[PDB]
Structure formats: C-alpha cells, structure tokens
Design an enzyme around this catalytic site. Structure first.
Site, PDB file in Angstrom:
ATOM      1  CE  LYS B  43       1.529   8.582 -28.343  1.00 52.85           C
ATOM      2  NZ  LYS B  43       2.397   8.399 -29.532  1.00 52.85           N
ATOM      3  CG  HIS B  96       5.343   0.889 -25.185  1.00 54.89           C
ATOM      4  ND1 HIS B  96       6.250   1.921 -25.113  1.00 54.89           N
ATOM      5  CD2 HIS B  96       4.735   1.005 -26.391  1.00 54.89           C
ATOM      6  CE1 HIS B  96       6.198   2.634 -26.224  1.00 54.89           C
ATOM      7  NE2 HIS B  96       5.284   2.097 -27.014  1.00 54.89           N
ATOM      8  CB  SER B 126       1.150  12.242 -25.448  1.00 55.36           C
ATOM      9  OG  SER B 126       1.693  11.762 -26.661  1.00 55.36           O
TER      10      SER B 126
END
Ligand SMILES: Nc1ncnc2c1ncn2[C@@H]1O[C@H](COP(=O)(O)O)[C@@H](OP(=O)(O)O)[C@H]1O
Ligand SMILES: Nc1ncnc2c1ncn2[C@@H]1O[C@H](COP(=O)(O)O)[C@@H](OP(=O)(O)O)[C@H]1O
Ligand code: VO4
Ligand code: VO4
Lengths: 282, 282
Positions: B43, B96, B126
């Site tokens: 995010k 990620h 987020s």
C-alpha cells in the site's frame, strides 16, 4: 441475484462472465488433433478427463490446467482460451457447451470428441450442490425450487434435455464418441478399453488396470490434482459441499420427494420421447 | 478462519501462509540479468510506479499480468513465479518482500531495482482498507486494533520499519533506486525524469508528458487495467473499499485519534532513530 449472474445467450442461460468476451470462444482456432471432451455440468467430466489424460500419457498440476476449460473466463484472472492458445498439442479441451455454441472450428477440422452424460435425476442432484459450492452462484431456496429451474433449462448451460439430444445427434459421426457415467460405474474396464481404442492406442492389461486404479472415486478424491482443492475456497467452497461428493448412482432417491420425482420423470418422458439414446437401467 | 490461521510467522516475517507453503519456488527463483525488481511495502503506491515504469518500457492487459507479483500464490489458480517463468525478457517483477526474503538470484545477478516507500501513518491507513477489501483476510476489529498490530510488525510482510530500513541500506547500491510516494505526489515530473534516466532512456518532454497524464490518480482509477476491477470480487471486494481509494497525502488525519497518533509517532521515532532516510515534510 440469479438473473444478474446469469443471462440468456443465444437461447442458453449462461454465466455472464463466460459470454462477455464470447468473440474469443466463437473465433477460437482449433487444431486438427485437438480432442474435445464435452459434458453437461456434473456428469463426470473430471472422471473421463483423467482417464483420457492417462491414456495420452501412456505435485501434479491441477486438472483444470492440464485440460483447459475452454469457455471458462473471469476477466483477466481466469481465461481458458488463453490457456489453450499456450497449450502444446495434442490439446485436450474441456467444455459444457451445447453443439450450437461450440467453436465452429472444431467441427470444421473434424476434431475427435468425447461426450459424456449421466441420468438427469442424478445430474440435478450433483448440479444442485455445485450451485451451493460456487460462492458467486446464488444458492437455490431448496432442492425443489432448483429442480423446477432444471426442468425449464433455466440453469447455467441450459436444458439438459436439449444438450443430450443435440450431442446424441452429433454422435452419428464416428469421430464423436458418446458415453454414459453409469456405464463407467457398472463396467469401467470395458469403457476404458473403448476409450483407448477410440483414441487409437493399444489396450494392454497394464494400461487399462493402471487407469482403473487411478481413476476410482476414492483415488480421485484424495488426489489434490483432481479433487479441486487446488482451486481457491473463495471461488469453490468445498466446505459447503465437496467436489468429490458421493460418486454413486441413484443419489436422487435421497433428494427427490415422491411428488417431484413423478413430475420430473413425466416431464423427462415428454422431453426425451423421440430420443434413441440408451441410458443404463437403474 | 482466525487471523493466525491465515497468517504465519516465516523467518521472522508474518506472511500469508499461502505465499510460504511453496517457498522453495521463490527461494530458488532464477533471475535474469535484465530483470527489474519493483519492491514496496504493501500500500505504498506499487501500482502507480509500476504503471510509470511500464510506460517507460513501452516508450509511452491487467497490470498484475503485465508485471507479475513474484511471491503471490494461491495453489494452482494463482502463481506469480509461473507467470514470470513464462514472461519474455525484459521482465518487470513486483514484490513486497524485505531484502532478506527476496530471491538471492536477484542480488546475485545484480539486477536493477526500484524501492518505493510512503509515510508510515498513511501506509497504515491504506493497509487497513486493504485488509478489509481482501475477502480472505480477517477484518480488523477497529483501526486502532490494526495500528497496534502494524507497530508490532504483526501484519502481512512484517514490520514496515524493518522493511524500509533494510531496503534503504540496500539502496546504497547505484542499481537500487529509492523513491517516495509523497515525492511523486508533490513533484511527478522530476520523479518521472529520474525514473526514465535510471532505466537508461531519454526523457523527452513528450514522453514525460504522456506518463504524467496517464499515471494520474483520476486516470488510473478509471483504467480497468490498473484499478484492479479485472480481479474477481470474490478475492478483492472493491465494494468494501475501492483499490484507487483516495490517492492523497495525510489521510491519516482522518483515522488516527490524537492519542494513537502520539503513541504511533513516538514509537516511530524509536524505530527510525538512526535512519537517514529523507521522508518529505508534510
Ligand atoms: N472417479 C469418479 N468416480 C465416480 N464419480 C466421480 C468420479 N470423479 C468425479 N465423479 C463425480 O462427478 C460429479 C462431478 O461432475 P463433473 O466432473 O462433471 O463436474 C460428482 O458427482 P456427485 O455430486 O454426484 O458425487 C463426482 O463425485
Ligand atoms: N496514480 C496514483 N496517484 C496517487 N495515488 C495512487 C495512484 N495509484 C495508486 N495510488 C494509491 O496507492 C495505494 C495503493 O497501494 P499499492 O498500489 O501499493 O497497493 C492507494 O492509496 P490509498 O489507500 O491511500 O488511497 C492508491 O490510491
Ligand atoms: O461440471 V464440472 O467438471 O465444471 O464441475
Ligand atoms: O500493495 V498493493 O500493490 O499488492 O495492493
């Protein structure tokens, strides 16, 4: 909503996701050696698919990857056509489409095809649970409500009756093998030898027996490649109902109340009246 | 399923058990000299910089297909590694993963990489909605409860602090570009020219203008290829929260009560005390 998810497409109620990009199915390009495996939903497609795959081959990738589901499509996440375009020959294609919706190229190239059916009452039962298991498909209010829809052909892929009849007629072709789920149940050895020969291979004890052993209900359940456990629960919730549910003949007796059965069978009579297809006696 | 049934600590990093079940596939992943790794903490604007980079590659299909999500895996339905193995070079890889979990082959081949970060408080906001939108991820009892977990690094992909610090150190390498979401927000033209040059291309005013116009929030929010509407609702329920949510700086002010903010910021200072990373003042 039922009709928000399903819409009539060329006379056949379909999952709108499978018809949104219909041009991809319609213009699908077949190859001379493509083998089409067609069935009405819940007639034993997984069973005969594994048998055929085993014949071809004389942590294993999920069956839905080994044998792409032609018209299956969910935007950019799932695309059977894409899979088939990248699949090396000889390709084995799975489909639930009636003859009138099957890509014309298959007929044009005169591809060998195998159609499998199951008795309507047992299909309806298996189909009912299929609807429950598919998270995005609205669960029928009751089995009866579902059967009413089934008789009307108001279920994904339409009328089972029209489906079987049309494919039965197509089976006039020597390159279109017509088979029965109940025949594989009551006499697998024969059906396997039949398939091996239809696919022009030498049937041997070793081959026939390996297939029979590997494709039994217990064996295919327990096989992660075939029991659809390789498929996200968010899509197929097997907690609601497992894919390899029962695998028997006559489960309709545990679902159709007397009244419904008589009504269903009467309707069946009217539908299949002039159809010479030979289902096995129960 | 319980939170820790879905998520499990893997080599010190809380991870989606589905992404670690077949970890050997990520660990032994084979990189190519010209692979470009785009790494971010969840995010932080991965989709934004991914589209910018893709546009540069094409000199001005769903993004998750164009740029495979390396470690993303959901049995046999979703597999980023499989996608990358079939992706023609030059491949753009999204991840990620903290530096310690990234396939060693990438470092070994000294691949160019782009790391993007965002201020922790806005990431938490987020990230909170991301958890809500992902159907298979248990929804936090409240934003506060989620923030407590965020500070503890008890969220998928672990500690944001450890994540940024480790990657910041890795950025010492001239082949590892370190960027900020807030910098793309406050000065996109510069950041775009910077990327175009890092990727060894010529920054024409036409190209830069194209990118800026195409990668705006209002544009990507209406681009089906980037707003993740090409991804099944059964997985990503954008009805709960859209992917292209707000795309602003400071949304934390609408979520962090006074108390929590002071506690979060205090914790942040102790976590980042000796980190020379230059986050934009806001
Ligand atoms: N090897 C096998 N033996 C018997 N039945 C099998 C089988 N493999 C699959 N089936 C049955 O075929 C149905 C699934 O259909 P399809 O493959 O066309 O989607 C299920 O029916 P039931 O719900 O009646 O158990 C399933 O149990
Ligand atoms: N072009 C763009 N401009 C601004 N913000 C963008 C953007 N594209 C994506 N984002 C923001 O990046 C976040 C998604 O992160 P990621 O892509 O890494 O998963 C969202 O933040 P918000 O939740 O704050 O709105 C999203 O709106
Ligand atoms: O009829 V099935 O093989 O799609 O479940
Ligand atoms: O952080 V994201 O680009 O996987 O949703």
């Amino acid at each position: 909503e039922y009709y928000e998810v399903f819409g009539e497409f060329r006379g056949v109620l379909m999952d709108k996701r499978f018809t949104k990009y219909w041009e991809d199915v319609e213009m699908f390009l077949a190859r001379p050696d493509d083998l089409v495996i067609a069935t009405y939903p819940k007639s034993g497609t997984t069973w005969i698919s594994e048998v055929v795959y085993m014949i071809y081959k004389e942590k294993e990738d999920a069956i839905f990857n080994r044998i792409p589901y032609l018209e299956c499509r969910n935007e950019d996440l799932i695309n059977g056509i894409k899979q088939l375009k990248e699949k090396e020959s000889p390709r084995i294609v799975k489909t639930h489409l009636p003859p009138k919706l099957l890509p014309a190229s298959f007929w044009e190239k005169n591809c060998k095809m195998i159609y499998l059916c199951r008795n309507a009452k047992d299909v309806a039962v298996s189909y009912y649970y299929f609807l429950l298991m598919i998270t995005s498909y609205p669960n029928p209010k009751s089995f009866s409500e579902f059967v009413e829809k089934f008789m009307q052909g108001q279920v994904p892929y339409g009328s089972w009756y029209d489906h079987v009849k049309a494919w039965w007629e197509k089976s006039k072709n020597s390159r279109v093998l017509f088979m029965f789920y109940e025949d594989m149940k009551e006499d697998i050895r024969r059906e396997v030898v039949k398939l091996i020969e239809f696919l022009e291979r030498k049937p041997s004890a070793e081959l026939v027996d390996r297939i029979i052993q590997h494709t039994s209900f217990q064996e295919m359940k327990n096989n992660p490649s075939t029991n659809y456990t390789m498929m996200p629960e968010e899509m197929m919730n097997q907690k609601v109902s497992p894919f390899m549910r029962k695998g028997i003949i006559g489960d309709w007796k545990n679902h159709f109340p007397e009244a419904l059965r008589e009504r269903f069978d009467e309707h069946y009579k009217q539908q299949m009246k002039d159809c010479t297809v030979k289902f096995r006696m129960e």
